[PDB]
């Protein structure tokens, strides 16, 4: 029993969605209706600095 050779994926994958979302979550930028992006490891810091409501 040799090591099996599966057929490669010939269609659309999750990698395009993940790469597009990770590009949109970095390097700032503009949306279609809003003002400006705030990237990951920046907007979390703003959330920590401004706090959240408690109880």
């Amino acid at each position: 029993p040799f090591t099996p050779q599966p057929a490669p994926v010939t269609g659309n994958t999750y990698r395009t969605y993940v790469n597009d979302a990770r590009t949109l979550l970095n390097s700032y930028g503009y949306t279609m209706e809003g003002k400006v992006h705030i990237p990951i490891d920046r907007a979390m810091d703003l959330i920590v600095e401004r706090g959240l409501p408690v109880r």
């Binding site: 029993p1 040799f2 090591t3 099996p4």
Partner: protein
Amino acid sequence: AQIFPRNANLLSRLSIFALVLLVVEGILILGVYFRSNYFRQVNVAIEQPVAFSH
């Protein structure tokens, strides 16, 4: 010469050689069977009731 024929010397030497080779082949067959992918269920697509696709 009284009992055994002319090729009995070659037959006896080849019998000793084949017995040693047969012992080595038996040990080898036992080792290959206990290390084989069929025995250890390696590289075989084990069938599932749903055939889930990872």
